[PDB]
Design an enzyme around this catalytic site. Sequence first.
Site, PDB file in Angstrom:
ATOM      1  N   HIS A   1       1.922   1.433   4.591  1.00  0.00           N
ATOM      2  CA  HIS A   1       2.394   0.962   3.296  1.00  0.00           C
ATOM      3  C   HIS A   1       1.203   0.892   2.335  1.00  0.00           C
ATOM      4  O   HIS A   1       1.327   1.184   1.147  1.00  0.00           O
ATOM      5  CB  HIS A   1       3.018  -0.422   3.464  1.00  0.00           C
TER       6      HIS A   1
ATOM      7  N   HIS B   1      -1.007  -7.233  -1.998  1.00  0.00           N
ATOM      8  CA  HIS B   1      -0.013  -7.084  -3.060  1.00  0.00           C
ATOM      9  C   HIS B   1       0.564  -8.454  -3.416  1.00  0.00           C
ATOM     10  O   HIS B   1       0.566  -9.371  -2.586  1.00  0.00           O
ATOM     11  CB  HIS B   1       1.093  -6.108  -2.662  1.00  0.00           C
TER      12      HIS B   1
ATOM     13  N   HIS C   1      -1.520  -8.054   3.422  1.00  0.00           N
ATOM     14  CA  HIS C   1      -2.011  -7.024   2.495  1.00  0.00           C
ATOM     15  C   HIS C   1      -2.177  -7.516   1.047  1.00  0.00           C
ATOM     16  O   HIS C   1      -1.619  -8.541   0.657  1.00  0.00           O
ATOM     17  CB  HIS C   1      -1.278  -5.664   2.624  1.00  0.00           C
TER      18      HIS C   1
ATOM     19  N   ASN D   1       7.433   0.804  -2.714  1.00  0.00           N
ATOM     20  CA  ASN D   1       6.286   1.302  -3.475  1.00  0.00           C
ATOM     21  C   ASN D   1       5.315   2.105  -2.594  1.00  0.00           C
ATOM     22  O   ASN D   1       4.729   1.570  -1.651  1.00  0.00           O
ATOM     23  CB  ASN D   1       5.561   0.119  -4.130  1.00  0.00           C
TER      24      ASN D   1
ATOM     25  N   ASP E   1       3.447  -9.929  -3.595  1.00  0.00           N
ATOM     26  CA  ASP E   1       4.397 -10.615  -2.725  1.00  0.00           C
ATOM     27  C   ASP E   1       3.721 -11.220  -1.501  1.00  0.00           C
ATOM     28  O   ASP E   1       4.293 -12.073  -0.826  1.00  0.00           O
ATOM     29  CB  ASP E   1       5.533  -9.670  -2.304  1.00  0.00           C
TER      30      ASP E   1
HETATM   31 ZN   LIG Z   1       6.811  -5.511   0.439  1.00  0.00          ZN
HETATM   32 ZN   LIG Z   2       2.937  -3.945  -0.824  1.00  0.00          ZN
END
Ligand SMILES: [Zn+2]
Ligand SMILES: [Zn+2]
Lengths: 216, 216
Positions: A138, A77, A75, A169, A79
């Site tokens: 998520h 993001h 995904h 989040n 991280d």
């Molecule tokens: Zn995460």
């Molecule tokens: Zn995320």
Amino acid sequence: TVIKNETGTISISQLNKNVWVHTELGAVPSNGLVLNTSKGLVLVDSSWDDKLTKELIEMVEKKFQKRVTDVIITHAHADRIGGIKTLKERGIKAHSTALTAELAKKNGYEEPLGDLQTVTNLKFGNMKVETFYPGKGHTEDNIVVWLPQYNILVGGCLVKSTSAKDLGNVADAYVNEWSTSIENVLKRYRNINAVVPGHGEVGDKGLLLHTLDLLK
Amino acid sequence: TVIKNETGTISISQLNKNVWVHTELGAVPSNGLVLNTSKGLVLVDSSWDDKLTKELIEMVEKKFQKRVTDVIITHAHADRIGGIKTLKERGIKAHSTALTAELAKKNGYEEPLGDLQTVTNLKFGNMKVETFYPGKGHTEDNIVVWLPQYNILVGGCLVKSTSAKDLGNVADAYVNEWSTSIENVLKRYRNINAVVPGHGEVGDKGLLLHTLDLLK
Ligand SMILES: [Zn+2]
Ligand SMILES: [Zn+2]
Ligand SMILES: [Zn+2]
Ligand SMILES: [Zn+2]
């Protein structure tokens, strides 16, 4: 076996011969995966940033004595895609769905390949890898990775650890659709040996059930 | 006007003439109200533990040179009910719904009054206060407090702050119903001015819409 840098901010933990978990402290840990294949090292996700991603890559290349060739981004993001710059500079293939690709350029990151489909099966040497888009959870683009030869599931931030009482989040989450998406994963993979959560210790099918409880 | 203590763990900010916000770090900040009335001091929620709660009490009692007569407990978590033992030994009336009381017992805390009904109007001298149980959300028992003379809403942990992207502990929460419960508050109070979140900076009605966004 667990190899770490001197500060312990980066560690690689062995699950079996050719499957290892990679964790980096951003002090918030983040899990990924490392696969030792005959075609080279294949990672599931990069890290919080380029420094950690570059150090992580040098770590695994040193250990397995081979080059990291492919990385699967679950995904858009930090991280997960924080080390996209590094991957590209190093000539590494950064696999992702088309949506993750567009969201990445939207979130202000360098654009991944956008080559993966809802269901994609890749065989790296003898290592079989399946990426599966279960629906929104998520994030709207989140995908999971499955190793049919080991019945191992990399849940990503879609799955919480056993002790987790938090969902993380949710600003970009679809909380109501999340439950259905996990049910889809449970439906697709009937026999699960181990599940790797986005953060925390490796567990089993319980992590999925636990995440559903958190969502109720 | 913002007054703290030598260590900086407890501060009190004036919202207006008779309304102040008390905040303590436990390292997360937790908000509550301090009401200066003609007949004593009235707090909305206590603190993380008995040490912090006692110190809080000693601070306001010294400042306003009055005694804390009543305290309204918004739910059964440490940041809310932590100093319950302190309240009872100082002769402070600890109001709560019957459910919050039974959950306090279940959680190992001394029992509050359990006197509050779904809609309870209390007047302390000049100060008017309304407690309302909107239904399940952050917890099964969460309630909100309304000050009709100022149109100020203490949302408690049912409401997230502006920069919060996380709902916090959802192990005890009812995620699906949390949305219907915020709608009940929105429908109940038509002209809201300021709204105090459980943690974070005071805002307005937009904090409720923000929390509904996170819940989607
Ligand atoms: Zn995460
Ligand atoms: Zn995320
Ligand atoms: Zn709470
Ligand atoms: Zn709280």
